[PDB]
Amino acid sequence: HHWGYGKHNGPEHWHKDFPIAKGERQSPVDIDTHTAKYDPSLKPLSVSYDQATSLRILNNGHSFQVTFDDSQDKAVLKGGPLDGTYRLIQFHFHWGSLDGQGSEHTVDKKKYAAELHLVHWNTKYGDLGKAVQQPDGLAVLGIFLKVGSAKPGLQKVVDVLDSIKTEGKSADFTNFDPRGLLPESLDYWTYPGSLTTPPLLECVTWIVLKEPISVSSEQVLKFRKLNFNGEGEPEELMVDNWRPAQPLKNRQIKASFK
Ligand SMILES: CC(=O)/N=c1\sc(S(N)(=O)=O)nn1C
Ligand SMILES: [Zn+2]
Ligand SMILES: [Zn+2]
């Protein structure tokens, strides 16, 4: 990709090829707890990942991503702020050059060590391609990572990262259960926003979980061994692959909990 996260191709440059970068509904945002008010009309989130079928894990040059078979309603997200049903297509992470930063969303300006994004598309639009053209096309479930005890459900992921060090490497990754990446509580904040990488389309209902998952320092250090560059190219270490908080502008963030 021509775009990246460095001085010369990072988030400050993106608007030149993707003008919507300066749009009215851009993500991520800061979640200000004084103003993210409880809404009693919000429903409990429904996560049904039991039949999730993972396929591949890859380094795409901006993150590492695990893909899923989205051909039927195997793993779906519904309820919450969502009308209808959204199929899981992939998850990936954003992380920092140190434990003190790396998340895209912030909470009262505080940055977590990383952020997991589980990406889902609205089945009423037929496929991902048409879905991304609709303001309610995607639902992304965002989960913060803090450094603490190890997350057993992340171990299968951490264990193959050394085999996909550079951009374009990938590996077989079947039978991975994404339920193992979820915290205890499904309490959430929600707001209308965008994809946080190009093309930055404003097609996302964001659902950000209040409770972070804990991963061990040992686990998150493996994230930081990845490279933005392809094999044979000059080394550019994949850290700080997060877009900074964008202005909330005229939007409202709602909380599912008090
Ligand atoms: C196909 C697809 O899921 N693209 C995505 S997911 C995403 S993110 N970082 O979850 O908001 N950004 N983009 C461009
Ligand atoms: Zn890409
Ligand atoms: Zn993301």
Q: What span, in angstroms and rounded, lies between the C-alpha atoms of 240 and 220?
A: 13
Q: Domain spans of the chain? A: 1-258
For residue 221, report the phi and psi dihedrals to the nearest 5 degrees. -65, -30
Choice among 1, 2, 15, 62 that is catalytic: 62
CATH of domain 1-258: 3.10.200.10
Amino acid letter for position 89: I
Q: Check if 62 is active-site.
A: yes
For residue 28, say if its preceding peptide bond is cis, omega within 30 degrees of 0: yes
Residues near 180 by Cβ (< 8 Å), separated by ≥ 6? 151, 152, 153, 154
Q: If you count them, how many residues does the chain have? A: 258
Q: Which of 152, 225, 204, 227 is nearest to 182 (CA)?
A: 152
Q: Whose CA is nearest to atom 10 of ligand 1?
A: 117
For residue 116, report the phi and psi dihedrals to the nearest 5 degrees. -100, 135
Tokens at residue 193, please? 């926003």
The DSSP secondary structure of 134-203, one letter per residue, reads: STTSEEEEEEEEEESS--GGGHHHHTTGGGG-STT-EEE--S--GGGG--S---EEEEEE--SSTT--S-
Q: What span, in angstroms and rounded, lies between the C-alpha atoms of 161 and 126?
A: 33
With beta carbons less than 8 A apart as the criterion, state whether 80 and 104 touch.
no
Q: Which of 184, 108, 177, 102 is nearest to 144 (CA)?
A: 102
Tokens at residue 104, please? 């895209």
CA 197 to centroid of ligand 3, rounded, Å: 7
Q: Which bound ligand lies closest to the C-alpha atom of 92?
A: 3
Q: What span, in angstroms and rounded, lies between the C-alpha atoms of 234 and 148?
A: 33
For residue 74, report the phi and psi dihedrals to the nearest 5 degrees. -75, -65
Classified as helix, coil or strand, 254 is strand
Probe residue for ligand 1, chosen from 115, 140, 242 as the CB with the greatest number of ligand atoms within 8 Å: 140
Answer whether 195 contacts ligand 1 (Cβ < 6 A).
yes
Q: What span, in angstroms and rounded, lies between the C-alpha atoms of 209 and 143?
A: 5
CA 35 to centroid of ligand 2, rounded, Å: 34
| Atom number, ligand 1, closest to the C-alpha of residue 128 | 1
With beta carbons less than 8 A apart as the criterion, state whether 47 and 186 touch.
yes
Q: What span, in angstroms and rounded, lies between the C-alpha atoms of 200 and 192?
A: 13
With beta carbons less than 8 A apart as the criterion, state whether 94 and 65 touch.
no
